Design an enzyme around this catalytic site. Structure first.
Site, PDB file in Angstrom:
ATOM      1  N   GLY A  34      -4.674 -14.611  34.442  1.00 19.10           N
ATOM      2  CA  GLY A  34      -5.368 -13.438  34.468  1.00 19.10           C
ATOM      3  C   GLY A  34      -6.904 -13.636  34.299  1.00 19.10           C
ATOM      4  N   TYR A  87      -2.904  -7.194  20.578  1.00 19.93           N
ATOM      5  CA  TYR A  87      -3.353  -5.976  20.090  1.00 19.93           C
ATOM      6  C   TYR A  87      -2.314  -5.548  19.051  1.00 19.93           C
ATOM      7  CZ  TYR A  87      -6.079  -1.861  18.850  1.00 19.93           C
ATOM      8  OH  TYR A  87      -6.914  -0.972  18.255  1.00 19.93           O
ATOM      9  N   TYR A  93       0.942   2.650  20.030  1.00 20.55           N
ATOM     10  CA  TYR A  93       0.741   1.066  20.399  1.00 20.55           C
ATOM     11  C   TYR A  93       1.909   0.221  19.525  1.00 20.55           C
ATOM     12  CZ  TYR A  93      -1.303  -3.126  22.497  1.00 20.55           C
ATOM     13  OH  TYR A  93      -1.244  -4.277  23.468  1.00 20.55           O
ATOM     14  N   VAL A 144     -13.393  -1.632  26.237  1.00 24.67           N
ATOM     15  CA  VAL A 144     -13.094  -0.826  27.285  1.00 24.67           C
ATOM     16  C   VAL A 144     -12.660  -1.745  28.373  1.00 24.67           C
ATOM     17  CG1 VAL A 144     -14.447   0.434  29.061  1.00 24.67           C
ATOM     18  CG2 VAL A 144     -15.248   0.665  26.501  1.00 24.67           C
TER      19      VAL A 144
END
Ligand SMILES: NC(=O)C1=CN([C@@H]2O[C@H](COP(=O)(O)OP(=O)(O)OC[C@H]3O[C@@H](n4cnc5c(N)ncnc54)[C@H](O)[C@@H]3O)[C@@H](O)[C@H]2O)C=CC1
Ligand SMILES: CCCCCCc1ccn(Cc2cccc(N)c2C)c(=O)c1
Ligand code: NA
Length: 404
Positions: free
Chosen positions: A53, A230, A240, A280
């Site tokens: 990734g 996260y 989340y 972001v």
């Protein structure tokens, strides 16, 4: 040559920016590199790094840190769309094109594999690449973000969901197209959607990677692997950490142990889940909560001198924890780079502003300006010293790019 070139501007289709500017992406990559080289080299880092990734966001920043902070040769794997005439490629394609160019200028190895990292085929191509070029790798960064996975053995297509578990939740958000604060309710995930999300974003494929590299013998003694996670503040917990996506992230915490056990007997290597801050990304306008939370967080952290994006996070993660003398460890054995976001005073300020933001005060209460700028920056737009009026050929090529 004007028929093969075009002026490229942002086009936002349903919260997705469907264009990317090749020159701006190159400038954005260069800025990330200049950050790393300005801060200075990182001592005792890996020299042969595989990033899964590697074309955007945190994986890109890991590649840049490894290469230009630690002096590593890097093999990147990603899934991106090449440019063609009239049709800009994805930002990650242009990012990697720029990376290969800057790596070569500095005399560093850079090779990339474009294809589905969830497949055995790509794992094989990756193994073959390491054997031919590197012998082995010292570090494997796992940084895939995907909405879906084709299971390599069974052929099954799993789809991830972004839903709460148990009760439905009311989430306040910012619609970035209409610039309205508004709430929506999400229904709780079905057991099926939870398992699918754990299949896609949990740790099985990370395991299948480290086992495949091992079974082929391409991992150096004292090797290291980390996958990114996260945890977030309490305000993101319902959706989340305690939702379907958090079920996947918690699967990672049950993978990292068998990973570490295998590498620790292997010259005292190590494996860690690494926790990073919210930034972001391409998917930020997946759910309108993220743009609202980022706009608030950016403002609060800027007032404290602690605002960071991808490159600043991952540079510290390498320098402090992956290669550093004082790893910043939590109670679970995770590496943490996210503590400035979780600081109690930041959470409190973000939480206080959360119930105060309206359509009228968005620009006085939040750094929505900053959110919008960083979002455009991702695709190579709004960048300093890029001439946006000039024609550009969207068909930017990459040397040592294996297409799978
Ligand atoms: N964005 C954020 O605020 C945070 C993200 N993270 C975690 O960091 C990791 C990276 O996420 P981002 O940087 O946001 O993602 P991103 O969208 O910027 O990049 C994901 C990478 O995955 C690659 N990819 C996706 N599907 C693939 C496939 N099938 N095969 C090969 N490559 C594929 C993409 O090409 C790209 O290189 C994820 O585990 C994410 O959950 C951790 C903390 C917060
Ligand atoms: C409400 C915003 C808080 C979440 C910001 C941190 C974050 C942002 C993005 N991602 C990746 C992600 C999150 C949610 C859904 C999907 N599909 C994906 C790839 C994360 O894992 C974590
Ligand atoms: Na990434």
């Amino acid at each position: 040559s004007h028929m093969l070139e075009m002026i490229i501007k942002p086009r936002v289709r349903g919260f997705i920016c469907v264009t990317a500017h090749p020159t701006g992406c190159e400038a954005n990559v260069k800025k990330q590199i200049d950050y790393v080289t300005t801060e200075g080299p990182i001592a005792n880092g890996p020299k042969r790094v595989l990033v899964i990734g590697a074309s955007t966001g945190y994986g890109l920043a890991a590649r840049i840190t490894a290469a230009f902070g630690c002096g590593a040769d890097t093999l990147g794997v990603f899934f991106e769309r090449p440019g063609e005439e009239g049709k800009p490629g994805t930002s990650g394609w242009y990012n990697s094109a720029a990376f290969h160019k800057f790596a070569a200028q500095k005399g560093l190895y850079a090779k990339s594999i474009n294809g589905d990292a969830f497949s055995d085929e790509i794992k094989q191509l990756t193994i073959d690449a390491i054997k031919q070029d590197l012998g082995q790798v010292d570090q494997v960064i796992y940084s895939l973000a995907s909405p879906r996975r084709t299971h390599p053995k069974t052929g099954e297509v799993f789809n991830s969901a972004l839903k709460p578990i148990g009760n439905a939740v009311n989430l306040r958000g910012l619609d970035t197209d209409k610039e309205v604060i508004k709430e929506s309710v999400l229904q709780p995930a079905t057991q099926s959607e939870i398992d699918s999300t754990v299949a896609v974003m949990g740790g099985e494929d990370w395991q299948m990677w480290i086992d495949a590299l091992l079974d082929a013998g391409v991992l150096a003694e004292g090797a290291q692997t980390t996958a990114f996670t996260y945890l977030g503040e309490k305000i993101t917990h319902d959706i989340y950490w305690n939702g379907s996506i958090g079920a996947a992230k918690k699967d990672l915490d049950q993978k990292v142990l068998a990973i570490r056990e295998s590498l620790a007997a292997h010259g005292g290597g190590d494996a860690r889940v690494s926790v990073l801050k919210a930034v972001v990304s391409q998917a930020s306008s997946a759910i309108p909560m993220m743009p609202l939370y980022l706009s608030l967080l950016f403002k609060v952290m800027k007032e404290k001198g602690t605002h960071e994006g991808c490159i600043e996070q991952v540079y510290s993660l390498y320098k402090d924890s992956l290669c550093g003398d004082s790893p910043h460890m939590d109670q679970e054995g995770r590496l943490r780079a996210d503590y400035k976001e979780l600081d109690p005073e930041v959470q409190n300020q973000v939480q206080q502003l959360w119930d105060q933001v309206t359509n009228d005060n968005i620009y006085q209460l939040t750094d929505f300006v900053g959110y919008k700028s960083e979002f455009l920056n991702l695709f190579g737009f709004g960048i300093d010293g890029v001439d946006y009026d000039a024609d550009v050929n969207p068909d930017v090529k990459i040397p040592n790019l294996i297409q799978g």
